[PDB]
């Protein structure tokens, strides 16, 4: 509706018999390939990303937001769980590190 790309904002400018909009839009660039999977099997449970996708640079799995590659480790506070993982097609095994276990193991 307002420029090609995801709309950030826009400014009006007066023209003789009309109006000229300057549409400021965000255009993603410099894309990179990654291997992906819908869920993660861990301890017999399927973990799906809260917001983002599971991406692997070949040998290590991460969660990223869909529009800017900013990788973060798969953890229990940014992935939710839904049943076991016999129904999903495309599951990959990996560890979902939880942040409470290191603190409790320090005891």
């Amino acid at each position: 509706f307002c420029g090609k790309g995801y709309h950030l904002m826009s400014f009006p400018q007066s023209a003789p018999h009309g109006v000229v909009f300057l549409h400021v839009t965000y255009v993603p660039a410099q894309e990179k390939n990654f291997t992906t999977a819908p869920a993660i099997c861990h301890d017999g449970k399927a973990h799906f990303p809260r917001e983002g996708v599971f991406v692997s640079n070949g040998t290590h799995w991460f969660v990223t937001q869909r529009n800017f590659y900013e990788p973060q480790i798969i953890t229990t506070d940014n992935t939710f769980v839904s049943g076991n993982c016999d129904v999903v097609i495309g599951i990959v095994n990996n560890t979902v590190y939880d942040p409470l276990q290191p603190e409790l193991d320090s005891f």
Binding site: K4, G5, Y6, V27, P28, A29, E31, T36, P38, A39, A46, F48, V53, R66, F80, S82, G83, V87, V88, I89, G90
Partner: protein, 89 residues
């Protein structure tokens, strides 16, 4: 072509329009909505459908747990269009 009346041919031939729609369809199937924003970035179609379920408010696990059923519904729904077009005048 009778007396002074002429019908000019459209600039885009029917084949060119078919090619436009084929391009749009391949883009939306393979890359989701990324190609409209800019460079076409490809996602597996299941994961893209999960994106879209998140869009409508349903969580993404609902698609993956029910992917076969959703596929069957979509296929049969497309099949119904052929009957509707071919038979209904």
């Amino acid at each position: 072509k009778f007396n002074g009346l002429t019908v000019l041919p459209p600039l885009l031939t029917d084949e060119m329009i078919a090619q436009y729609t084929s391009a749009l369809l391949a883009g939306t199937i393979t890359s989701g909505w990324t190609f409209g924003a800019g460079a076409a970035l490809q996602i597996p179609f299941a994961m893209q459908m999960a994106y879209r379920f998140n869009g409508i408010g349903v969580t993404q696990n609902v698609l993956y747990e029910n992917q076969k059923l959703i596929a069957n519904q979509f296929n049969s729904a497309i099949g119904k269009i052929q009957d509707s077009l071919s038979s209904t005048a």
